[PDB]
Design a protein around this ligand. Sequence first.
Ligand SMILES: O[C@@H]1[C@@H](O)[C@H](O[C@@H]2CO[C@@H](O[C@@H]3CO[C@@H](O)[C@H](O)[C@H]3O)[C@H](O)[C@H]2O)OC[C@H]1O
Ligand SMILES: O[C@@H]1[C@@H](O)[C@H](O[C@@H]2CO[C@@H](O[C@@H]3CO[C@@H](O)[C@H](O)[C@H]3O)[C@H](O)[C@H]2O)OC[C@H]1O
Ligand SMILES: [Zn+2]
Length: 185
Amino acid sequence: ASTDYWQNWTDGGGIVNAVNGSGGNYSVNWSNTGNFVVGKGWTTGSPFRTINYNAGVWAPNGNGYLTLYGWTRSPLIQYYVVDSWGTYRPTGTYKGTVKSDGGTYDIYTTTRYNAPSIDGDRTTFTQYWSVRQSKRPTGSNATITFTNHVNAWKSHGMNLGSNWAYQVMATEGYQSSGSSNVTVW
Ligand SMILES: O[C@@H]1[C@@H](O)[C@H](O[C@@H]2CO[C@@H](O[C@@H]3CO[C@@H](O)[C@H](O)[C@H]3O)[C@H](O)[C@H]2O)OC[C@H]1O
Ligand SMILES: O[C@@H]1[C@@H](O)[C@H](O[C@@H]2CO[C@@H](O[C@@H]3CO[C@@H](O)[C@H](O)[C@H]3O)[C@H](O)[C@H]2O)OC[C@H]1O
Ligand SMILES: [Zn+2]
């Protein structure tokens, strides 16, 4: 399935110059930002999708994540599979680990309160994370075998919602500057 979804969200802080490139390609150049999320992927997420990407540029200066990023409803859950980051490795309530695609990821949960989501500007929701224990090398074709994460989460009592929303390979930033260039398929 070729990508069909363009995610381009900013809370309005700083500069987020995002380019919707040809096919699965996008880029972001950002400066002194609030929170933003830019990426490409699919209108409807699947627990069985293999996400492929190649980050030809991964150059955060401060907090950025290079991450699978997506949502379900029923219930409302945000999830991440974080392959690389900048100055900050995201963590939460430690649940366990999962091995996938040549890496080991820690599994965490967090909760957001009064926060933006696909449902509104001020919402409360759980987040599920796989965060790689070390930054993944970038520049070569990489795979996220999402089933492995979903199954590990499930085994730790972290069940996703029944109603799948979008699923993207994203650049998320907070209080940072940077450059990224990623192709997704
Ligand atoms: O940042 C940019 C990189 O993402 C880009 O890398 C290329 C991304 O596309 C890859 O081609 C895929 C190979 O596998 C096939 O099954 C897919 O259908 C193709 O799309 C290619 O191999 C990568 O080199 O390079 C340019 C950077 O700016
Ligand atoms: O049109 C609607 C959009 O406005 C809506 O935007 C979402 C807003 O919330 C964003 O998620 C936050 C940023 O990412 C993480 O840091 C946080 O946990 C979230 O608070 C999300 O990226 C946007 O998609 O999406 C739905 C549309 O109907
Ligand atoms: Zn386990």
